[PDB]
Design an enzyme around this catalytic site. Structure first.
Site, PDB file in Angstrom:
ATOM      1  CE1 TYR A   1      76.855 -26.182  63.149  1.00 62.52           C
ATOM      2  CE2 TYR A   1      78.138 -24.520  62.182  1.00 62.52           C
ATOM      3  CZ  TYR A   1      78.145 -25.556  62.852  1.00 62.52           C
ATOM      4  OH  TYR A   1      79.167 -26.119  63.672  1.00 62.52           O
TER       5      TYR A   1
ATOM      6  N   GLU B   1      77.252 -19.957  63.183  1.00 58.30           N
ATOM      7  CA  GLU B   1      78.362 -19.606  63.763  1.00 58.30           C
ATOM      8  C   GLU B   1      78.856 -18.511  63.917  1.00 58.30           C
TER       9      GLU B   1
ATOM     10  CG  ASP C   1      76.675 -22.976  88.236  1.00 56.38           C
ATOM     11  OD1 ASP C   1      75.378 -22.675  88.156  1.00 56.38           O
ATOM     12  OD2 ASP C   1      77.138 -23.887  88.299  1.00 56.38           O
TER      13      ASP C   1
ATOM     14  CB  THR D   1      71.471 -24.860  84.120  1.00 62.62           C
ATOM     15  OG1 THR D   1      71.677 -25.720  83.043  1.00 62.62           O
ATOM     16  CG2 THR D   1      70.322 -24.989  84.655  1.00 62.62           C
TER      17      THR D   1
ATOM     18  CE  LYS E   1      70.490 -27.401  87.312  1.00 63.18           C
ATOM     19  NZ  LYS E   1      70.911 -28.848  88.003  1.00 63.18           N
TER      20      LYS E   1
ATOM     21  NE  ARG F   1      68.693 -29.652  80.789  1.00 61.61           N
ATOM     22  CZ  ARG F   1      69.348 -30.862  81.158  1.00 61.61           C
ATOM     23  NH1 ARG F   1      68.549 -31.788  80.974  1.00 61.61           N
ATOM     24  NH2 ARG F   1      70.737 -30.703  81.332  1.00 61.61           N
TER      25      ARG F   1
END
Lengths: 461, 462, 461, 462
Positions: free
Chosen positions: D61, D63, D217, D243, D246, D252
């Site tokens: 983690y 941050e 986008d 993204t 694709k 992802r």
């Protein structure tokens, strides 16, 4: 020691405040010694003025008749109830189908109160574009995205426009925009549109996109009362109005709203929301002197004399526009159906500013105005005020002659000094031809009566 | 058909054009002078104000402001408004280099909302005095059920601060704590039923600590502020708004005062243009020029030595009234007053303000029920301005105190004889000879005093 | 020519991308060669990792089981349905009373989706103050009014606080603030609170002020599953969670919501709003590999071994805190009821930054943290990760000894070089005492196992 | 009870810990390689990507971002993220002095919403491609009934622009007119089912004319952009989001690219800090570091010569497929494609996309119904990336075209025999030997090609 009541409290203005008294006397003379063609102005009756200037100003009566917050409202309630019932009568409304709130301080607060009543913050609104003849309170933002009107600050506005070649409202583009934008409220009515409104078509658009339909009839409300133009009440959910323009009343506002069954056994829901928005959401105590004065104006508006007046306002605007067009001038839409004409000056190579300034120097008051939604290229001219002084068609044809002379001088100056405003100003200085027309204006203006005060006892003659 | 001659419709007096309305105004004139008017938000303004209010100034539409109008014919309207502005600064002893003012708000509520529009974005946070604690609707109001009532709480995010529930004074420590938690962009001071002066210096310290603008709505006390009889909000506030008809004794109108000049980075205040633009074009149309004219008149009157003596007398009358009431055993919130009003707590008597307000109303004594200690409303609010304007002094307000004493004495007797339910209480109001005797003593007392704004000798109804 | 599938598509990472492979191998060693005390971290199972790294990443399946937008979801639906039913079982929820959505990408999107589902923009929210132990997604704005969290940008937040002298949630001030502010939603749960939550009292407050009650149990969800702390489900309307902290799963989020009759014949209305907010309002296709991995973690979370683990996490935190307090150290609230301790360093004249930095140099990972809601004065220490490596109380007492040594060195440096950070840094450079403790840390750390990968086949030993 | 040994719960493989889930994944692996996958928003990523995705990076983690983390232990996570960022710029041929990128968005939808949060205030105006015209939900969506569906239309004010209803191309003239009327602060380009390239230069002229920011986008075409096979949005846009799974063929995840350096007043771009702050602390928590690792892997792969050839082949396959369909008499929106997909208009056949999608689904041919010409959905959207990743070339996509031809031929026959109602249509799907023959020919065709991401020789289900 306090001043005796007689000293401070009963002594007339002329003695308490000579400065203000003198300025009011000068404004009185200005109002009757020129030609007032501002379409958003009228001259109201002495009776209205007497109620406006009355002890009614002393009563603070938050709430409405029968649901007040304190006592002593036995007579204020009757005045307001009378004002409301006279308002329904003036516009031929059935009380089971329409209600009215007469507490808005003015037309612009009336609009914002209506919006607050039926919309949530940031709901979408559509109204006539300012360059197309619409009003600030229907929504206005600049090309840079700066939100100018509060309507565009607290709600999301999108203007619809007139057709750029005919000057009529483009109803097809209206519908296409309303189907894309999906406003919760469509506003109709406007400030400088010279034709009547197809409220039936606005109703079809609003139904197709699911919107409320509000008409702001501030400008033509007098013509609506006299049934001389289409009635918005036939198709709109809400009608707002200022009360001092063609209605010839005091400065004040009203909100009319549908009541009773909808055309699910459904009933309209506007009455309580509208009243609550006005008070307690937006206003404090109503201006009761305004409500008294308004009730007076609404009774006057119901008389056969007022219908004759509204007829004459239309006939005077038509006669003035015909006189102008007969001189080769171009009116937007080529005529008028209401109280005003919109004069397109771009065919003359002039801006509205130039003509407005030169007219103002001859005591002819018009206002520059944008044309065909596209410096403003025209001037807006209104018939209500001078019609109230008793002028008829022949008199407005003579006004047209003064305007004809005024634009001729404006072109003479533009040709002798230049097309830029800095240049044009050079020709106004000590212009003998302006001086002559100003004299002819004043002589003509001083041949007609004046409502609201007695010209015979005014200080300046 | 033909048009009415201008003489017929346009010059004929109201009594002939509209007898109905004329008669109702005459009746209202009589009502205003036949009783005792104790509504703290009411006054009786001068005939001079009324003469300017009812004038041809109503006919002129002058969108914009002096020097930047949208059309011509404004030569005299501009002078009247400039005079109204300069007299507004003079009346409140403001340096034109440090303060500006806009005199176009139709009333005090639009003045507030225009000020908010000028300096805040939609949903910015605002704090104002809670309504049960003496605050005003336009400072923010939402119910325990969460219904947003005030437009101020609809278009902005409000959080009220409260009076101390035991002393009735503004709880400045809780104010500071709430402000540091909530972080308002705007803190409002001033109120409707608060009987003490305001510690603006402390509000300024709080505002500075939390990064807020500080606005005073002096609608109720603005007459006392002009006469330098209460603390000056201008010493500490960025913006001061006001209605002009309460203690200021003017027409129905509003004003917004704003700082200008250097901030005390060489940065200067930025309020002036934003305030003006918010009033117009953003929110209003053409100003109500007859109101501006009438307000200019009231502001010259408010700068007179007589007005300063009037303000002193308002405060003295409210004090003498409260002292007379507390001498009869009654309870006032904070135990007295420093301004134009007293807030009478009736809960120790087992009464509601509604019952006292109704019986007073039946003796032509106009008060209003009012919440108390921020906790049916358990008090009545009583104001001195209006009757002081009819010339009443301390002895007269002690006699008013006696009428209130008799009124609440009757109220207790009715409650005792018929009961606490309003249905019961109403029964004691019918053919009550002691209400009649009070009504008569009130009307007789009332008729001993003059009345500004109109001539009693010309009234239709004497 | 395209690369053969075998070349680009089947070749292992170590060959395709040696740079990334090597860095992952270094991070693997870092994770098992130090002492990991970050309370928001755990070490998940190899089984979870295997499902996370799987062909499930290839399936785009917008919608939910039985209501998808395209075909080929026969197996993705079963995985998601299994994940949902395993989620209800893990938290002992009746399916007729609770539903769950397992598509949120992570805990923070889960929160914002819940808000979007049940609130309108600018609705009021209350959540635990950040200096009091709350989380960014519960609302955060600075003293200057700068809105930091999106929760405070798109909604109106107001934080509630711990009592400044006890460190416990001040429930009386909570209720008073909720009655003034009137939030539409109250959030409970937090990041650095060392005690259990009185959900019953939060429910009384929410009912008194009319608010929804949401618990974000990201930090203690594992303890909730093992029924080792109070269950938020008994009193909250909505429960959100991240799935990787004490729950020991993959990085993912879940939203639980009440279904069925309310306690008017009224039924809860959350299910459809919650699902719609997640998709289509906020997310696209769910990360199906995350959902598969989560289903694995939720089955593991249902096992007797996981209840024993959650018990051990609590016992380890208690044993560590007792060891610290037994050395004179001050814990906020003087102990713990959950997975973490909050160590107050202000009694030592130290800041959390100083201790965090020195620990980090010995491969002891804690985080500085604000204390009693009032530079941060403490450090937050968590037991989940090291408990997952099999450490028990005696091992955590030894961790306490390493922390004791670490703070002693921090004080020795502050005394020899100065109280300002610029001064303190001077003592970290080539410090032999730090070097010694780092060696003792690594030796101790390397005596325990490691889930998620085989220490025996890692690149760096 | 005692704790499970780490070896038992923590090191045991999935097939033993969770046979249920293990078996479902094995079945999904088989489904992915036994049929023809034509969903334009799907791909098959590499085993290397999957290896980085399923790694101990999930446990960290972190941050904040490299150089400004909230806690320590970040020495290797920082290096991985920095490498992911630098490889993101390299893959899209961006100068690090002119472009920055944030690789922490959990996915493309959060990347969009974080970008909006960075540069807009709540309720600012946004325009994006209408959903029936090929746009995406996160670009704004509300129904004819006025229901705000997309969060973008909930927290901001959206207005869609549309394709020309007869040509299927973006109507750039109406776009300009709508933008000058509505005055968006943000115009979005890029879409989901648009089969032509984008004229970013024209979008830039519109944006400049109306004072808008311009965001692309590129989620769908980002692989083709990396390979410089379609127009570059970076040449004209302020911000580019994407993204990563694709056409880019990655995990992802999401990224946000933003301009930096001098604006072409000596003013410089201000996006970088706002974008980063919006991703964290404003909207997300700790990044999903295993996704960042897997994305770094995919971005190195996307910079390889083989990936450029892959992108060329995607476009060639989509062209050869569309040409084969139009050779059979079928209608494509705009009559062809310039990218990875074709949009097949079935309305001339008297069919809905639903019916074709269902029958295809029954032959293990995965397509999706899709609206067409911005006007039940009357088309299907067919994408080339996934099957191109299995090595199919033009001849293979012509055979896919033949399978689609046979599929829609059966669909018409069923509709003709049973009827147009779906209840009727379903009847023709039962024990249909010609569906079986197509299903079999599809599975046999499918099994001739390799499969990335896992070894077919190790599958549980062959």
């Amino acid at each position: 020691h306090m001043d005796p009541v007689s000293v401070w409290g009963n002594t007339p203005l002329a003695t308490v405040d000579p400065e203000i008294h003198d300025l009011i006397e000068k404004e009185k003379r200005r109002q009757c010694r020129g030609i007032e063609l501002i379409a958003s102005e009228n001259f109201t009756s002495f009776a209205v003025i007497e109620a406006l200037g009355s002890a009614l100003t002393n009563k603070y009566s938050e709430g409405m008749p029968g649901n007040r917050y304190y006592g002593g409202n036995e007579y204020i309630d009757q005045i307001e109830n009378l004002c409301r019932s006279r308002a329904l009568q003036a516009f031929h409304l059935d009380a089971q189908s329409w209600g009215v709130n007469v507490q808005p301080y003015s037309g612009s607060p009336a609009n914002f109160a209506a919006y607050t009543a039926v919309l949530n913050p940031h709901d979408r609104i559509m109204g006539l574009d300012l360059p197309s003849g619409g009003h600030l309170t229907h929504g206005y933002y600049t090309s840079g995205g700066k939100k100018i009107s509060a309507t565009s600050i607290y709600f999301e506005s999108l203007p619809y426009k007139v057709n750029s070649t005919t000057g009529y409202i483009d109803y097809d583009r209206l519908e296409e925009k309303a189907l894309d934008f999906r406003p919760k409220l469509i506003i109709c009515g406007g400030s400088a549109y010279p034709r009547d409104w197809d409220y039936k078509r606005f109703r079809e658009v609003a139904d197709k996109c699911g919107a409320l339909l509000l008409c702001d009839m501030a400008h033509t409300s007098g013509l609506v009362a006299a049934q001389e133009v289409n009635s918005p009440f036939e198709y709109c959910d809400i009608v707002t109005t200022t009360t001092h323009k063609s209605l010839r009343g005091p400065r004040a506002g009203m909100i009319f709203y549908r009541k009773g069954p909808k055309p699910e056994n459904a009933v309209y829901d506007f009455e309580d929301k509208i009243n609550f928005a006005v008070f307690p959401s937006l206003q404090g105590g109503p201006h009761n002197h305004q409500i008294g004065a308004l009730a007076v104006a609404l009774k006057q508006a119901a008389s056969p004399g007022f219908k004759a007046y509204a007829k004459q306002v239309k006939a005077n605007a038509v006669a003035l526009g015909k006189y102008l067009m007969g001189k080769g001038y171009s009116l937007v839409t080529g005529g008028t159906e209401n109280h005003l004409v919109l004069w397109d000056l771009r065919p003359l190579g002039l801006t509205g500013n130039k003509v407005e300034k030169l007219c103002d120097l001859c005591n002819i008051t018009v206002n520059k105005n944008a044309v065909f939604g596209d410096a403003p290229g025209g001037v807006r001219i209104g018939a209500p005020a001078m019609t109230s002084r008793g002028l008829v068609e022949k008199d407005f044809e003579q006004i047209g002659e003064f305007l004809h002379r005024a634009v001729t001088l404006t072109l003479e100056i533009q040709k002798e000094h230049g097309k830029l405003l800095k240049d044009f100003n050079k020709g106004l200085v000590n212009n003998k031809a302006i001086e002559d027309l100003k004299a002819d204006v004043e002589k003509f203006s001083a041949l007609f009566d004046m409502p609201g005060f007695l010209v015979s006892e005014m200080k300046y003659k």
